[PDB]
Amino acid sequence: AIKRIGNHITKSPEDKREYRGLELANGIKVLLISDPTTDKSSAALDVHIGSLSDPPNIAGLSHFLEHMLFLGTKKYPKENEYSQFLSEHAGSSNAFTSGEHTNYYFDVSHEHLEGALDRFAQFFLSPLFDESAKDREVNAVDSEHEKNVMNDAWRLFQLEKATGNPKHPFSKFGTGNKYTLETRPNQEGIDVRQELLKFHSAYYSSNLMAVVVLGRESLDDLTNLVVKLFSEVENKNVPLPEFPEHPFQEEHLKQLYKIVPIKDIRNLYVTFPIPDLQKYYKSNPGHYLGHLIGHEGPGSLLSELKSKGWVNTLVGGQKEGARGFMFFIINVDLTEEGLLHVEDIILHMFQYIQKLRAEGPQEWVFQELKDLNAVAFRFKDKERPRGYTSKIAGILHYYPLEEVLTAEYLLEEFRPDLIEMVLDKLRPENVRVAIVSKSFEGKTDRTEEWYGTQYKQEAIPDEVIKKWQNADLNGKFKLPTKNEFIPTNFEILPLEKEATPYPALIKDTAMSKLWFKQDDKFFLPKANLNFEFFSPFAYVDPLHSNMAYLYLELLKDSLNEYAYAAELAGLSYDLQNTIYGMYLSVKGYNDKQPILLKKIIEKMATFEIDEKRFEIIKEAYMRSLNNFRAEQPHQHAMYYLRLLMTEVAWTKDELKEALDDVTLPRLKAFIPQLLSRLHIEALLHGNITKQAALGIMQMVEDTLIEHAHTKPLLPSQLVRYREVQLPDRGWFVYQQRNEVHNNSGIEIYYQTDMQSTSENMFLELFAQIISEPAFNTLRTKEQLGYIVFSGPRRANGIQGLRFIIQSEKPPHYLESRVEAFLITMEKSIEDMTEEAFQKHIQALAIRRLDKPKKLSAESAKYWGEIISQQYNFDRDNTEVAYLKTLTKEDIIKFYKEMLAVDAPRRHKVSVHVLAREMSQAPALPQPEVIQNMTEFKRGLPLFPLVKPH
Known part of the structure; x- marks a missing residue:
């Protein structure tokens, strides 16, 4: 069905990916992507x-x-030949399922286009569906449902699915467990496989495909190469499944729900099923409404509700649905009085509605946000071929070959009748109510069928309803003002005589230390900025560190209402405390980062405290503290991991107890004493000069000395936390009992060495060789569990090796199969050929060597050097030069003394995380339990630190 008609596409003039749209007569939407500079198609x-x-x-x-x-x-x-054929050349395919789309996608190393796509076309002619694939994949879906047991967002999602019409096909169960996949068909004698051939043959083969190919060949060769390769589709004209009805058919409207959660959260969920605006994509009022609902501005509703301390957080907006209907959701967080004043909260919602009817539609907001989406669609660098293509293939069904680029980021007209129309749809007639509370006991009878949560309808009486319509007034509400954060800076600066591929120390003080590089590759007007604020007193105790956390949190929350337009404009940032100090990040365009950052420094420099805000944040993180008794044992294990492998570490218990004495005069008195004297080190990257960077840094520290008379630190109080030496042959372990979860955890750790050039490649190569046999035997074959992880530990300038496995087993039994895998690798050493060696190290080379694909990516790596003070900028080529100098016997000699069971250099330590009620093995030595980790570390030496490169 080879048909083609096309022309030039309005393609947002920054991309180089050449395009062509066409529709094939067998119902295949085809988009041609041509980027002859891409490595991977x-x-x-x-x-x-x-x-x-x-x-x-x-x-x-x-x-x-x-x-x-x-x-x-x-x-x-x-059986696995397609999947293994994509396992050969590093291509990672995936597929997903939706009510109206089923989408397939893959990638390939360089040229395997024709190859893999020929392996992919056959799927439509002859799928096989043999015994073993079936019987293992049903186990894989059941394990996916089993790991999706405790994800609460899907529970609330299914609670939306289940509290409508139980006859409407919205009431189906999406994934399907063991019980519905193979328990109802075989007790009814129905072959699942004949239904599969039914489904595939009748439904799929006709029409309604949406293909897209990122190829790097030309516009025409790949075109008549794959369109020849896809003529196998034969039309049967299967109709488009759409629904002429909504699923909430006035049985469950104007109704309430009372939800018992699994986590201790407090939320209110408001939902509006709303008609179709997919045909109204041209004006698209729903994005403007989503802008206007969750807006944070002068005189706004949320500004007042935060200002009254009633609302911690919220989210609202449009939820996509089927073709016929669409949804509109509002999900807000609750405080203590938020818990008691829910109806008045709905009143405040109606106050904002009264504000929206009061001022009607707005146009300058529409042109302003239209210009923001104009700029943002206008300037895009490039994209990830995964996730993007699945999205635009989601809308490839719905849009013409020129509208697939200009997808929703351009709007022709203003429809105030539509705005008023959906505003009329947003009424107390149309409200669905869902209340989430753990205080619901003895009262919520109706239990979920699959998961088992329990709820009750208990419809709102009519007094509140009629009270809701007549009492519609406005108080101190104002419309938010025009933004000023729009830049006209669009000028790319040409590179100067200072041509470096790495940031140079352009400014050094005893106060500061400043490293800088401008964008060589990406050429954007944007900039990324990274900042550490070092202070000694950060990790002196739990008490003040908690005060730092609360300080930084409520501090960041203060200007957040101002910050909303900046993040709404595309200006992202980060504030984060560390064990060392504070972490600042500034990301976005070049317009007002100095100006805004000046306002940030003055704000966190000069800050005041409210009393009840202090009480809410103090109690809220206090609730966040004793939550930490209930989490996943791998997270718990990584906690103990980073606990044991530092110099000092404060536990959560003493963190819980020490907040009993925290008063606000004590806090607000300590803070300027805290903030009196500290250090800042910073990485700045993007479209700027060196001198303007010096001025920004100068600005900042000037402001600092201006407010708090900051003086520099001592180079004797420039410290790090060290890492613990072992007694070179010892293996100790201890246990921790999980109260709640029935699963057991374990983690095994190896102190190899510092990061020398040899040890990096030792650990990387050894890590690479243990990935696939562990993948083959332990999780797959032994079927231990799902949590099976290994890998590096770059910490305190010391490299390290760790193994993370959480399964429901006896832990010494589990140790026995770990050691069994160790012996398996021991034999697998001598089983390596030269070819496996060479292809394996080439795999690791291309795994390690890659140019970055994001400025933030390489900045996080560089910043990861900066926090470790290493600066070895060309460690990659150095390590590759070492990588080519490596033998099999090298890793034998690495194994025997350091890694083997007969080892004088054995640094092995395990940690047990118990459960709720908790082919050759040698005689392991007896470990000892660790009652006092300080008294454990009492006779253990400490590591040196690294001479910085």
């Missing part, structure tokens, strides 16, 4: 047949099909 395929056309008896049928569609062709009848 890609492709994506969407089928508009979704998970709403499933049979009513079997849930998640299309899910199990698109799993099983993967395995088996008539050309290659082997």
Whole structure:
């Protein structure tokens, strides 16, 4: 069905990816992407047949099909041959499932386009669906449902799915467990596989595909190469599954829900099913409404509710749905009085509605936000081929070949009748109510079928309703003002005589230390800025560190209402305390980072405290403290990991107890004593000069001395926390009992060495060789659990090796199979060929060597050097030069003394995290339990630190 008609596409003139749209007569939307500079080419395929056309008896049928569609062709009848053929050349495919789309996507190393796509076309002719793939994939879906047991957002999602019409196909169960996939069909005698051939043959083959290919060949060669390769689709004209009805058919409208959560959160959920604006994509009022609902500005509702201390956080806006209907959700957080004043909160919502009817539609907001989306669509660098292509393939079904780029980031007209129209849809007639509280006991009877949460309808009486319509007035509400944060800085600065690929120390004081590099590759007017604020007193005790955390938190929260337009404009930032000090990040364009940052320094320099705000934040993080008794044992294990492998560490218990004495005069008295004397080190990157960077730094520290008379630190109080030496052959372990969870955790750690050039490649190569056999035998074959991780530990200038496994086993049994995997690797040493060696180190080379794909990416790596003070900018080529000088016997000699069981250099330590009620193995030595970790470390030496490069 080879048909083509196209022309020039309005393509947002910064991309170099050459495009062409065309629609094939067999119902295939085709987009041609041509970027002849890309290393990796890609492709994506969407089928508009979704998970709403499933049979009513079997849930998640299309899910199990698109799993099983993967395995088996008539050309290659082997089981993993497509997947293993993508395992060869580093291409990571994935697929997902939606009510109206089913989408397929992959990538490839360089040229495997024709190869992999020929492996992919067969899928439509002959999928195989053999015994073993079936019987293991149903176990994989059941384990996916099992790990999706405790994710509460899907529980609330299904609670939306279940509290509507139980006849409407919105009431289906999306993923489907063991019970619905293979328990209802075989007790009814229905073959799942014949239904799979039914589904695939009748539904898929006709039309409604949406393909896109990122190829790097030309506009025409790849075009008549794949469009020749895809003529296999034959039209049957399957109709588009759309719904002529909404799923909330006035049985569950004007209704309330009372939810018992699994985590201790407090929320209120308001939902509006709303008609279709997919045809109204041209003006698209819903993005403007989503701008106006969750807006934070002068005289706003949320400004007042934060200002009254009633609302911690909120989110509202449009939820996408089916083709016929769409949704509108409002999800807000609750305080103590937020818990008691819920109806008045709804009143405040209606006050904002009264404000919206009072001022009607607005145009200057629409042109202003239109210009913001203009600039933001205007200037895009490049993209990740994954996630993007799945999104635009989501809208490839809905948009013409020129509208697939200009997707929603351009709006023709203003429709105030539409705004008023959906404003009329947003009424107490249309409200769905869901209350989330853990204080619901004995009162919520109706239990969930799959997961088991419990709720009650208990409809609102009519007094409050009629009270809701007549009492519609305004108080101290104002419309938010025009932004001023719009830049006209668009000028890219040409590179100067100071041509460096790495940031130079352009400013050194005893107060500061400043490193700088401008954008060589990406050429954007934007800039990224990284800042550490060093202070000695940060980790002196729990008490003041808590005060720092609360200080930084409520501090950041203060200007946040002002910060909303900047983050809304594309100016992102970060404030974060560390064990060392504070972490600042500034990311965005070049316009007003000095100006705004000046306001930031003056704000956190000169700050005042409210009393009840202090009480809420103090109590709120106090609730966040004893939450930490209940989390996942891997997170718990990483806690103990970073606990044991530092110099000093304050536990959560003494963090809980020490907040009993925290008064505000004590706090506000300590802070300027704290803030009296500190150090700042900073990385600045983007479109600027060196001298303007000096002025920004000068500005900052000037302001600092201006307010708090900051003087520099001593180079004897420039310290780090050290890492603990071991007695070179010893193995100690201890246990911790998890109260709640029935799973057990364990983590095993190895102190190799400092980061010398040899040890980096030792640990990387050893890490690479243990990935796939552990992947093959332990999780897959031994079926221990899902949490099975290994890897590096770059900490305190000391490299390290760690193994993270959490499964429900006896831990010494689990140790036995760990050591069994160690012996397995021991034999797998001598089983390495030369070829496996060479291809394996080439894999690690291309894994390590890559140019960055984001300015933030390389900045996080560089900043990771800066926090470790290493500065070895060309460690990559150095390590590769070492990497080429490595033998098999090198890692034998690395194994025998350092890694083997007969080792005089053995630095091995394990940690047990117990459960709620908790082919050859040698005689391991006896460890000892660790009752006092300080008294543990009492006779352990400390490591030196690194001479900085």
